[PDB]
Symmetry: C2
Subunit: 510 residues, 2 copies
Amino acid sequence: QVEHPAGGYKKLFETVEELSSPLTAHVTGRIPLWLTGSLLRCGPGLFEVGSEPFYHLFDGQALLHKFDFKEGHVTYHRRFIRTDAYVRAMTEKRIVITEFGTCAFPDFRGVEVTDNALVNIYPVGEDYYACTETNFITKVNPETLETIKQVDLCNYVSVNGATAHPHIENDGTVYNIGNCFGSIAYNIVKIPPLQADKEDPISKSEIVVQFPCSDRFKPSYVHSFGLTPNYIVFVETPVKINLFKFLSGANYMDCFESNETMGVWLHIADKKRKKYINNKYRTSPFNLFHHINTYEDHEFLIVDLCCWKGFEFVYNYLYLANLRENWEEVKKNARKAPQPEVRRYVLPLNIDKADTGKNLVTLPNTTATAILCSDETIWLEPEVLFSGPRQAFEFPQINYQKYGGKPYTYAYGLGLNHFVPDRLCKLNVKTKETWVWQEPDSYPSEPIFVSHPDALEEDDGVVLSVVVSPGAGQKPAYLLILNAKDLSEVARAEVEINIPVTFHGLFKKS
Amino acid sequence: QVEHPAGGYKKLFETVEELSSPLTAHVTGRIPLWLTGSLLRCGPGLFEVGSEPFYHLFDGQALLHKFDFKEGHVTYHRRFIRTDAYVRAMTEKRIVITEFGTCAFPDFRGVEVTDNALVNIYPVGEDYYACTETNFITKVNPETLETIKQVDLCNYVSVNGATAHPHIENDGTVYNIGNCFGSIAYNIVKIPPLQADKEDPISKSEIVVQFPCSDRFKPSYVHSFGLTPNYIVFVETPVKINLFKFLSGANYMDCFESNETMGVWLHIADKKRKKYINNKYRTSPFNLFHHINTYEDHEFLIVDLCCWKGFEFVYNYLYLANLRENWEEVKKNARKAPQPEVRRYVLPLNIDKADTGKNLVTLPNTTATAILCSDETIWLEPEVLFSGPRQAFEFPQINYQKYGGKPYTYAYGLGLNHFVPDRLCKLNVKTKETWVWQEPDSYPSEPIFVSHPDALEEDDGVVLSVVVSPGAGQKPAYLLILNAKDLSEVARAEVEINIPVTFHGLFKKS
Ligand SMILES: NCC[C@@H](O)c1cccc(OCC2CCCCC2)c1
Ligand SMILES: NCC[C@@H](O)c1cccc(OCC2CCCCC2)c1
Ligand SMILES: CCCCCCCCCCCCCCCC(=O)O
Ligand SMILES: CCCCCCCCCCCCCCCC(=O)O
Ligand SMILES: [Fe+2]
Ligand SMILES: [Fe+2]
């Protein structure tokens, strides 16, 4: 459908320099007065060290970005995060730490796991942490973008790592998941809010509940998980980490393999009684990176997911050399890739043996099914919410503070065209209506939703996305502000420098 | 969504009497001049013999119906088909032959298989045959509706039975499928067109190709199949016929069971070289009654299906006592039923071992996938074309003569609301747009498409459906003629008597 023959998307993967202090952006249209605060995003900003290239999308050195709405103007600022990976590279003028898809070559100390925090940033107590998916997170300063310290979660709780998508309750309580040793297992970690003593909430971390693993020695790759007021949902996919190959030229990609026969196993745990529920939910194979939202509806959990159909690891398609190709080749490279699809799964909670052989999903407004089998597995089929050929609705966001974990209607997403980000999408998950914002030669980022302080409806607010527009007669980038009702444009804050790709972030209200 | 508290649909399952000669219908609107010919449909018309009830939807005695467009008026006529089942019942004043869900009680001869031809009618040579799904078909007179003879396909070819959905090529060549003995197997039967000798084409029947069965002694129930210019497609579902229980109080329903672990196996055969292709296509469990259309697109077959998600046999929900309940109870009874969904499957024909682990479906306009596994199974996921909660798009029809087996855009269907027929639907299978015709307290039949003789586009024509409208100030039934472009009404031909449910039929042009 939409084509990008000029190859502008290449700019998303080009090195930039940090700034000494904030630039003032030039605003077009009108920024609502109520929008005061800061958009903070992370992504790779350095794609080679001298003449040594990084190879994968997830290898570039973490760059922390900020758009600040204050005092009737908008500023843009970015700084590299002073991780061990980045600081040692700058010192030694080479790739020192092995990244996801780039092995470092040398030139007793133990394996040096990357702390390249390029993926997301989130609050813990009164602090902010940039993260990747390892055991290392980096405390950063949200005002100045200075790097404060490295933290090793292994010093506090028993997990080997943790996702870049913790869930955060309204009181500031933080939940995350990581694999551990139990036999392998997956641990839900909880960090309480800041208390009166003002001591670091991370030092009060604990394990809430443990999920079993389908394979004794091979945990699945986990990228996110679901949380409602009463339940925790974990989706175990057939993308496996081969721990044998892990602990014996290698990078992180080399240790992944796909299990061809397991499909997807879905798991739930009682959040409040802190216990695993032994219901054997089963379905077809897909990769999963992002949960959209999860909620409870009578005796059922509604589990909305951004899926990639198949068991081949989608990250195989995300080496930089492939994302930098010309457009005809980008399309051709995605021909045999897993197909993206938004799916709603419905998990019955009150399972009666007398209904063996039947569909347990008795809700009136879904076509999802769940069949109780005689072996006691529950075989799920989804209701499809969005499906376009090689057109993914990904990097999903909702009105999180008020609708996270609850019944809801709207999701916002980044549209990927053969893996190239080229549109912003709003989905009504009940009616499947969509709204799209797109301009030619414009490559946007994850949309972040900000609620109007006096909102009455779920979509009373704006959506923020950072857009790269390399075209000949163009400011090379801008912050885009859309009305969430219909994705119509409200304002842009343009800047005169490039901005590389970013993955995730937050809006910090002020 | 739409509700039927008055329970008018009960009239669909009420006995009627045959007519001595045609009634003249009263026409409202205007019937196109080009529409000349006859609509012939079959269904049950006698739901009890004296005080002995029939229990299942498929048990009532075959009634042959005709709407005749001739000479600037429309007539309606119906006659019971004088099958052995019907004639013996009328003679003995009781249920003599066991029907699908009604065991006959007595009052050396061999098992007496029903020849109650209530399901469909189709041409063979210059003849027309009413059928069910047994070995017995009944030659009928399309002008007078007289019954001519019983035919036993077992006298001509080696099958135990045959579906009520043969495919008919433009030259009159007839293809069908039935299970047989090979070990059980499934045989494609071919009947040639009428030749110069004028001898009965059925006496020239032969077996073209044989499909293997997933279970040595248990064939799956088969209701229809797919045909393109070069391929035959057969879908083997987990609804099994237990031949053990078959050959040992019993009716046909009692012999069915669901296989919980096989899912669906899809099979193709080279039509012209008459050989089975050994590609092991596999997917999730569903019931299938009706193929919509099948065609070839580069090295792929496109297989569009009306599916019911799950392995429980959907016919369990179609006993007359359940279909006659009040509306709140009808809905409640369908709560745990399989969910209807229209699905497009895509079958790769050129399978390369070097693509093991990847999605082979490289077509640009689909989200269907097919993954080649190391065990050499090919795991399919569908593109969903239509999905509504307990709202089935069923009894599908297309512009068959010109688009059957070929690339196409439009399907027409009967909308079932918790198994109650209450709307007519047109689907664009490429865009997924739909059009609906619905009126309150009106229960339509399968829509049959008739092409304009000077058609330029696929949907240049009309759709015919027989509608029952029992409401207080109403002619109790009518033939509905809709414009196929948008399902807007063109004319009705009303009659002053009831018409019970009909399943399938044809338009015979004249
Ligand atoms: N968000 C994309 C993946 C990226 O954050 C990344 C970059 C570097 C290392 C890494 O490791 C994930 C590992 C978790 C522990 C087990 C091996 C895989 C993951
Ligand atoms: N169209 C609905 C089913 C109906 O035609 C019907 C009515 C009566 C008998 C029957 O038999 C199907 C059998 C095929 C041979 C093996 C057993 C099932 C099927
Ligand atoms: C942000 C656009 C990047 C261009 C490549 C987009 C392809 C993403 C495919 C889905 C995988 C999502 C994993 C990345 C998000 C994360 O690291 O948390
Ligand atoms: C025609 C409306 C009948 C009312 C019940 C409709 C439920 C049909 C469920 C799908 C099964 C289709 C099988 C019947 C068609 C046939 O016998 O060929
Ligand atoms: Fe992510
Ligand atoms: Fe049928």
